[PDB]
């Protein structure tokens, strides 16, 4: 049951936009809302509006009086001397709650005229006509106007609606909540050479009487919220999908072949999401818009998605196909379960984010294989356990503070830190995988189909929300639908992993009792760490003995420590028979390293990742080597690679080398075995016999049979030896000698890989392989032996580093004349120049990176150069570079770059709270408090980034370096 927090119900909204002026960055328009009051004596009506100048408001064609105030413009007063962050977080939460449409509130308060009170008490319709104007919007809707001359279509100027969550208040007045569903009528009067893309279906396109402008009329009969309404106006090249004909793809001019190749996969994503769920795609059209200077890499609205143009690749670009493919896939998953089925509160957001991430993981499983699915699930689980042990924990479904261990309030999406938002979505889809583990996948897809079917029977009624609230899901409704389809309720699993905000830590060690033939496990939990919680459920453990692989369920109550499980025979060591594996197959194992008295080959605690856990198991090194070689699970091979770094014995070198030589191993395991072999090789110097690690293996796999030092000409058509070939010198360059100087045998090998590179014969580009070669050249740089702080000149230039510097100069200059993809070689060469500057080789001068961080460059070059400037101002304690970065945060045209500068200055801070630095003035405290209070008031993501930066630099209490 859904009861509105608003005293009115909104039925229909007309959004008309005229006069989109690109020179002056200005729109004019009106908005006409059709509300039905649910309570008599409605009097004031409270709507949401930011940055719009409200000209006049007429209610039922009668002139009404409005008052506007935004408490989130300046959160605390300018003349308050408070400088602690808990004060700002409480004031910011109160300010966002005072404009919240999820309460009854709002920023624009319109007073109903007196003569309509007899029209409002007996509950009859009210039609509110506001007309407004955006004069020059800061972060409302982004105007990308290039400075080439010509007409606005000839120079490539466009507008798009940017922002996250409820940010539609930034460009027209609305009820900007996800729970106020209404039908829509959208008119946009644009230039005749431009096209206006929006939500709904385009019913017509009429000309103006001078035929210089045309009006696009859109209609949206599926009741969506105001927060799902978008807009993209530009000189877009239109491409109808040749497979599905209601899907149109819009790109920027001159990028039509890239659009043709890139969006050619999307019909398979549509077919997948419509056959695992049994509902068809709910909207009547689908539109993909590719734009410049995007807010996020992929945004999903109702019947529309806005991607950045940096996803567009051609047919000869690999290492970008899978990333763009999965961006399209998660946009479509959010089309199904973020835009059609919406949220009922700010709680129950974990339901929608979990269903979106879970069905996108099912797509990844079918498309890229179960092994890529397991690797992705393991990397997300490692991400969450790192974040939750780092700071507190992520609390899905809080109850309204519920989480007081962090520095922000979790009551609203616009007060969350961006890393918390990312980890929120990550934990939501892993908890949905856990619900699939308890209640099987076909029942899970039946739950999702029942939600979609209730929403689509709701979506066709005309009753103003008598039935339109069946399109809003809640937690209680989701659990009730689960209990309807399965008969089991998941309330212990919901109580543990949703309502409780923690992950578990397992420390395991075993001992084999030879007398009674048992395996005595010893599993203890660390439940006193700040991020942890105590697990009391069951726990699966998989033991591989000589007779095969056996699963055991252990009951781990609070007082439990020793778990005795039984062991089988050892009669497959009496005769040589094959040892049967986890799957149905069996292999020949070399049992010379195994103990004579124990049959068990390896043990895995929680193999299926059925809890949110971090396992620290103490096996013997031969058990880790057997688990690396003969396991049929990629997460166990990865964890054995990760645990073999502590055992540098030559049997582990043989194990990793046999993994590296082995095709029919998953390629991301071999790419990890490269770096593990490099670390082991660095640890057993003065024992290593022959050549450096992986060199003979590289010449055996990727070089000519007649010439060992000449590499084969590039043929990248295998896509697994391409990735292994481009990752093996990067790990080979980490080879550390006894003198701590990289062997001139590996550096010469990398330089010969660079010289003899011929790419005139493959059908794929070479930009990522050459960029990884520059990364391998940067990995070989050891710190220089400066004497008496000698000024770095050409007289003291290392003879090794002169070759590296010549190569990166040649590569960067050739990129200036012939570029590649993603400007990968510019990014790699800027990263390598920063590596050479971090050691004492090149003079520590930020002027090159400051010239590459200007506005007109590509955004990857910009963020690489700004990462170099952030690293410089951390190491050299530069005041003027920090003022340069803070000025660039305040006034840069691209807001993604501002968010990225705040993000990088949070990750690599110039000082922490423990450090005494010269940069801890009262002036810097006043600048960052002014940046939290004012200055970042227009983005909701810069303000949370400024809160994160103030927390990283000065902590939760009063800045110490202050009177």
């Amino acid at each position: 049951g859904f009861e509105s927090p608003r005293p009115y119900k909104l039925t229909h909204q007309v959004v008309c936009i005229n006069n989109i002026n690109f020179q002056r960055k200005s729109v004019v328009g009106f908005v006409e809302l059709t509300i039905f009051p649910t309570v008599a004596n409605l009097n004031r009506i409270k709507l949401n509006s930011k940055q719009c100048r409200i000209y006049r408001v007429r209610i039922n064609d009668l002139e009404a009086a409005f008052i506007y105030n935004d408490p989130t413009l300046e959160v605390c007063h300018s003349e308050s001397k408070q400088r602690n962050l808990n004060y700002f977080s409480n004031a910011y939460a109160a300010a966002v709650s005072a404009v919240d449409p999820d309460a009854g509130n709002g920023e624009l308060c319109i007073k109903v005229p007196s003569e309509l009170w007899k029209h409002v008490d007996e509950l009859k319709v009210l039609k509110i006509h506001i007309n407004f104007s955006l004069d020059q919007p800061k972060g409302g809707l982004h105007f990308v106007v290039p400075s080439v001359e010509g007409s606005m279509a000839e120079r490539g100027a466009h507008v798009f609606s940017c922002g996250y969550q409820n940010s539609t208040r930034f460009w027209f007045p609305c009820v900007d909540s996800y729970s106020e569903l209404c039908t829509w009528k959208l008119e946009f009067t644009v230039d005749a050479a431009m096209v206006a893309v929006s939500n709904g279906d385009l019913v017509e396109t009429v000309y103006t009487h001078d035929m210089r402008k045309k009006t696009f009329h859109y209609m949206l009969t599926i009741p969506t919220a105001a927060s799902n309404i978008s807009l993209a106006i530009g000189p877009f090249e239109i491409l109808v999908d040749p497979y599905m004909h209601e899907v149109t793809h819009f790109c920027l001019p001159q990028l039509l072949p890239l659009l043709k190749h890139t969006t050619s996969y999307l019909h398979e994503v549509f077919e997948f999401y419509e056959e695992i769920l049994t509902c068809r795609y709910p909207y009547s059209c689908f539109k993909t818009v590719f734009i410049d200077e995007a807010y996020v890499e992929v945004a999903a609205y109702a019947s529309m998605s806005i991607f950045s143009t940096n996803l567009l690749h051609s047919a000869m670009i690999i290492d970008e196909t899978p990333l763009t493919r999965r961006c399209l896939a998660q946009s479509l998953a959010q089309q199904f379960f973020g835009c059609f089925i919406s949220r009922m509160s700010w709680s129950d957001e974990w339901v929608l984010k979990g269903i979106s991430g879970y069905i996108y993981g099912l797509w990844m499983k079918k498309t890229f294989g179960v092994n890529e699915y397991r690797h992705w699930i393991k990397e997300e689980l490692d991400k969450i356990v790192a974040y939750e042990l780092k700071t507190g924990g992520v609390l899905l479904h809080p109850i309204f503070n519920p989480a007081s261990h962090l520095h922000f309030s979790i009551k609203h999406p616009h007060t969350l830190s961006w890393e918390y938002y990312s980890m929120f979505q990550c934990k939501a889809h892993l908890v949905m995988r856990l619900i699939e583990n308890r209640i099987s996948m076909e029942f899970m897809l039946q739950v999702f189909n029942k939600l979609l079917s209730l929403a689509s029977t709701a979506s066709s009624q005309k009753f103003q929300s008598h039935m339109w609230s069946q399109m809003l899901v809640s937690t209680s409704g989701f659990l009730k639908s689960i209990s309807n389809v399965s008969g089991k309720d998941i309330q212990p699993l919901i109580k543990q992993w949703v309502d409780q905000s923690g992950v578990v830590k397992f420390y395991g060690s075993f001992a084999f009792n030879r007398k009674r033939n048992v395996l005595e496990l010893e599993i203890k939990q660390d439940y006193t760490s700040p991020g942890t919680q105590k697990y009391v459920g069951p726990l699966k453990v998989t033991v591989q003995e000589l007779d095969g692989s056996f699963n055991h369920t252990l009951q781990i109550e609070e007082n439990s420590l020793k778990h005795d499980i039984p062991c089988h025979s050892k009669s497959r060591r009496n005769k040589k028979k094959k040892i049967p594996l986890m799957n149905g197959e069996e292999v020949d194992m070399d049992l010379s390293a195994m103990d004579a008295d124990s049959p068990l080959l390896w043990i895995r605690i929680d193999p299926d990742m059925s809890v949110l856990r971090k396992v620290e198991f103490e096996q013997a090194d031969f058990m880790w080597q057997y688990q690396l070689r003969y396991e049929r699970d990629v997460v166990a091979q990865q964890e054995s690679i990760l645990a073999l770094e502590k055992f540098p014995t030559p049997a582990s070198r043989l194990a990793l080398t046999d993994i590296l030589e082995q095709e029919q191993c998953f390629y991301r395991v071999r790419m990890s075995a490269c770096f593990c072999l490099a670390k082991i090789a660095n640890s057993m110097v003065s024992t290593w016999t022959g050549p450096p690690a992986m060199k003979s293996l590289f010449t055996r796999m990727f070089c000519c049979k007649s010439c060992p030092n000449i590499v084969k000409t590039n043929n990248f058509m295998s896509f697994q030896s391409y990735f292994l070939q481009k990752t093996m010198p990067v790990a080979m360059a980490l080879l550390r000698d006894v003198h701590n100087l990289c062997p001139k045998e590996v550096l010469t090998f990398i330089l010969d890989l660079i010289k003899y590179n011929d790419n005139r014969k493959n059908k794929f580009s070479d930009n990522y392989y050459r960029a990884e070669m520059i990364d391998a050249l940067a990995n070989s740089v050891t710190p220089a032996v400066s004497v008496n702080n000698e000024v770095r000149t050409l007289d003291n230039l290392n003879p090794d580093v002169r070759l590296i510097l010549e190569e990166i100069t040649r590569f960067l200059n050739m990129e200036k004349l012939l570029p590649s993809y993603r400007h990968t070689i510019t990014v790699s060469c800027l990263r390598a120049i920063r590596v050479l500057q971090k050691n004492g080789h090149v003079p520590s001068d930020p002027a090159l990176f400051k010239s590459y961080a200007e506005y007109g460059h590509f955004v990857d070059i910009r963020i690489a150069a700004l990462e170099a400037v952030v690293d410089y101002t951390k190491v050299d304690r530069s005041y003027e570079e920090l003022q340069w970065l803070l000025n660039m945060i305040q006034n840069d045209p691209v807001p993604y770059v501002r968010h990225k500068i705040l993000n990088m200055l949070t990750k690599n801070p110039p000082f922490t709270k423990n450090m005494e630095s010269p940069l801890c003035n009262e002036a810097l405290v006043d600048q960052l408090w002014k940046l939290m209070n004012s200055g970042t008031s227009h983005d909701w993501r810069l303000r949370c980034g400024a809160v994160d930066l103030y927390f990283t630099l000065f902590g939760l209490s009063r800045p110490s370096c202050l009177p």
Binding site: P146, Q254, L258, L312, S314, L812, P819, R822, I861
Partner: peptide, 25 residues
């Protein structure tokens, strides 16, 4: 300037066009 000269880093207008686009196809 004689030894190791670097071409100076020049600002463009649309950097994604010179980054992402392939030149030999």
């Amino acid at each position: 300037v004689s030894t190791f000269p670097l071409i100076a880093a020049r600002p463009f207008t649309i950097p994604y066009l010179t980054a992402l686009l392939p030149s030999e196809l």
